[PDB]
Amino acid sequence: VNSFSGYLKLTDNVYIKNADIVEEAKKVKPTVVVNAANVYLKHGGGVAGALNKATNNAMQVESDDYIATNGPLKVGGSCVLSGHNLAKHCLHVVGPNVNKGEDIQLLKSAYENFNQHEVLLAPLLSAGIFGADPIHSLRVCVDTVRTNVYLAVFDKNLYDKLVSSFL
Ligand SMILES: OC1([C@H]2CCCN2c2ncnc3[nH]ccc23)Cc2ccccc2C1
Known part of the structure; x- marks a missing residue:
């Protein structure tokens, strides 16, 4: 049992909700919040x-x-940093950015990082300003992540489109 509330249960291990991930993080204070990062960890938008x-x-x-110590991440890669006031840890995960010409096939590799954590609060990787189809991102998530993931969809x-179209 955990403190996530109001999620629609998609599968054995994937849950989804209309929520601002910032406001969700502040309420639940999860062990792990996932950031939709870029390789430079320049947290400008989205x-x-x-x-x-x-x-x-x-x-x-x-x-x-x-970054000064370690250099950039790989597309498809991740690092664990502090969650600051939002969570214990933040898992910064780099999904491919279609608006940069990056390979959408790397999305599965990006979601594999979630399997190193038993429970996570997370956005749909590569969605929003990263330019991928969110329906596809949700499909890859469900078919890749085996640990317990609570997906916050801001819009x-x-x-509703993701729920109604989910297979
Ligand atoms: O969910 C979405 C992602 C990507 C963009 C921002 N975003 C957030 N998600 C969860 N919490 C958030 N807080 C602040 C931002 C934000 C996925 C998506 C895909 C296409 C178009 C809009 C959206 C919303």
Whole structure:
């Protein structure tokens, strides 16, 4: 039993809700919140810009030190950093950005990072400003993630389309 509330249950291990991931994170304080990161951990917009703003830029400060030490992530890769005031940990996961010409096939590799954590709050990877089809992202999520994932979909209209079209 966990403290996630109001989710529609899609599968044995995947749940979905219309919610602002920032506001959800502050309520539940999950062990792991997933950020929709880029390889440089530059948290400018989308989910990343919103999560960083909620940390008063502390996420960005920590991220800049991470990159200075380690260099960029791989597309499809991830790193675990602090969750600051939002969660215990933040799993920064890089899904391919279609608006950069990155291979959509890397989306499965990106979701595989979720399997290293028993429970996560997460957005649909590569959706929104990353340019991929959210219905496809949800399908890859369901077919790749085996751990317990609570998916927050910010757009109410998109949420209904995702639910109504789910196979
Ligand atoms: O869910 C979506 C993702 C990607 C963009 C932002 N976004 C958020 N999700 C959850 N919480 C959030 N808080 C702040 C932002 C945000 C997925 C998606 C895909 C296409 C179009 C709109 C959207 C909303």
